[PDB]
Amino acid sequence: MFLPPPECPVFEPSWEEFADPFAFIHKIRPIAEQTGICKVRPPPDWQPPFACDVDKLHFTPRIQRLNELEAQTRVKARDYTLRTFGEMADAFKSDYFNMPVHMVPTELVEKEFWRLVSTIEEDVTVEYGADIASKEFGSGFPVRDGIKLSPEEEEYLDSGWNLNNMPVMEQSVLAHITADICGMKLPWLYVGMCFSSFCWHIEDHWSYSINYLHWGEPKTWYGVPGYAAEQLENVMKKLAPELFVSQPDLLHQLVTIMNPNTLMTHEVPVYRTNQCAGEFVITFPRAYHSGFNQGFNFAEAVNFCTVDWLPLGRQCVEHYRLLHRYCVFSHDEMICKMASKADVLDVVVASTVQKDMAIMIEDEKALRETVRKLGVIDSERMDFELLPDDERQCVKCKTTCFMSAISCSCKPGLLVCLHHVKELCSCPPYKYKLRYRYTLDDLYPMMNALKLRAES
Ligand SMILES: CC(C)c1c(-c2cnn(CCNC(=O)CCl)c2)[nH]c2c(C#N)cnn2c1=O
Ligand SMILES: [Mn+2]
Ligand SMILES: [Mn+2]
Numbered sequence: 001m002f003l004p005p006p007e008c009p010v011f012e013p014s015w016e017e018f019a020d021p022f023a024f025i026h027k028i029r030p031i032a033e034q035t036g037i038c039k040v041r042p043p044p045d046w047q048p049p050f051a052c053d054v055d056k057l058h059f060t061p062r063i064q065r066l067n068e069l070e071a072q073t074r075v076k077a078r079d080y081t082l083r084t085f086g087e088m089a090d091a092f093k094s095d096y097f098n099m100p101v102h103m104v105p106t107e108l109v110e111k112e113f114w115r116l117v118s119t120i121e122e123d124v125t126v127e128y129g130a131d132i133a134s135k136e137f138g139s140g141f142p143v144r145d146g147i148k149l150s151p152e153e154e155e156y157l158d159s160g161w162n163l164n165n166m167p168v169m170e171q172s173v174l175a176h177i178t179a180d181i182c183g184m185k186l187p188w189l190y191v192g193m194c195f196s197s198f199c200w201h202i203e204d205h206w207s208y209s210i211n212y213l214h215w216g217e218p219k220t221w222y223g224v225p226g227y228a229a230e231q232l233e234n235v236m237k238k239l240a241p242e243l244f245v246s247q248p249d250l251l252h253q254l255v256t257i258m259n260p261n262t263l264m265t266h267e268v269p270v271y272r273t274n275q276c277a278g279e280f281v282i283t284f285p286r287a288y289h290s291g292f293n294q295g296f297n298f299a300e301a302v303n304f305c306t307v308d309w310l311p312l313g314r315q316c317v318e319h320y321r322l323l324h325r326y327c328v329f330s331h332d333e334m335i336c337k338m339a340s341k342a343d344v345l346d347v348v349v350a351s352t353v354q355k356d357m358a359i360m361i362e363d364e365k366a367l368r369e370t371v372r373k374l375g376v377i378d379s380e381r382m383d384f385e386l387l388p389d390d391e392r393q394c395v396k397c398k399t400t401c402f403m404s405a406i407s408c409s410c411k412p413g414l415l416v417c418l419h420h421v422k423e424l425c426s427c428p429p430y431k432y433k434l435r436y437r438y439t440l441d442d443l444y445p446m447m448n449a450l451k452l453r454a455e456s
């Protein structure tokens with residue numbers, strides 16, 4: 001038996017409220033960050049086109065077994081068209097229930113999902129699509145291409161809710177990152193079938209995410225507020241300890257399906273929703289979420305980072321260091337990139353970046369004093385941003401270095417961050433070298449330029 005979590009908040013903004021997505025998200029944040037996820041129904045005449053030929057859209061399916069607490073990975077031959085995938089998917093669901101696909105109630109599919117995942121006798125496997133846009137299978141929103149668009153497609157080209165606009169919109173600081181981090185910054189396309197499932201996870205760097213269901217049967221979500229993130233992790237550590245073995249790569253972290261009733265039993269707040277076609281789901285920083293598809297559908301989702309998020313992004317990279325997990329990008333490098341563009345930044349952005357930069361500079365001053373007292377005397381400026389990420393990771397904690405690192409002539413090519421000076425080599429301290437991107441004297445005017453831009 002299954003007891004459905006309480007429903008998450010649903011917002012129905014008017015057009016005035018809906019027009020600017022970042023202003024609207026900021027307004028709902030007090031309510032929505034208490035539930036981790038929320039649903040947004042756009043005003044009734046915001047309806048972007050869905051004009052695809054299912055016979056020309058191709059993608060490589062992925063296979064999924066459905067066993068509660070079984071380890072699965074994040075995704076990185078075979079081929080379906082959207083038509084043949086849809087036909088396989090609909091026949092699977094109608095054969096599974098011996099009913100037409102739409103008369104299966106969502107409550108029932110939900111019940112049956114949690115039954116089949118917990119029964120070891122059942123060996124159900126399903127297939128799904130998950131990838132970024134490609135020439136073989138593009139975004140569900142209109143994009144610019146030199147094909148003629150209808151005036152209705154043109155209406156939605158520059159919408160803030162056209163998710164293709166997210167990796168380039170001013171108020172997502174992720175847009176400032178020059179590094180090509182395609183897996184994180186670009187929209188993902190999700191082609192679902194009944195019971196295809198996304199395991200419990202938070203987004204990289206604790207970013208927000210936003211998900212739009214273009215068409216098809218609904219997507220069922222479970223969400224946990226960011227404040228209960230460690231509570232949830234402790235519950236999963238106890239019940240599925242195999243998922244917490246230290247992982248060699250970011251593409252090797254383990255995730256799993258877990259009944260939300262199990263989390264509720266252990267006092268973790270969980271909320272649910274059925275996302276229907278034309279609706280958005282927003283996940284907030286560090287809000288765990290999982291779910292499954294009710295049947296054949298097509299969704300598009302993207303990460304983003306508001307100024308709200310900057311302190312949490314710093315807190316996240318700290319937490320990655322404690323865990324020895326790889327970063328997707330350097331947070332400090334992104335801060336300094338924005339500082340170098342201060343004259344062009346939005347004034348509220350400049351004020352918030354400035355506050356994060358002050359913490360960064362004080363933390364960095366203290367760390368350099370600590371390593372100097374360990375006998376590291378030699379030093380040389382180094383343009384960390386020119387190194388491929390895997391050439392500038394701390395040997396100990398895997399963090400991506402940018403502000404500074406320690407090298408040692410006895411272990412050429414290796415780096416540690418300033419927390420792990422004692423982990424690099426066994427040579428005497430005068431053979432170590434501090435490699436730094438900026439002097440403290442470079443840094444204070446960078447921050448000052450942000451204060452000027454903000455105070456205007
Ligand atoms: C079932 C698919 C189409 C799907 C996925 C998804 C990605 N990867 N896998 C395989 C299992 N691994 C993990 O879930 C890694 Cl954490 C599923 N993610 C998501 C999200 C999210 N956020 C929302 N809708 N949505 C989907 O409908
Ligand atoms: Mn099973
Ligand atoms: Mn997600």
Ligand SMILES: [Zn+2]
Nearest residue numbers: 394397417420
């Ligand atoms: Zn380190």
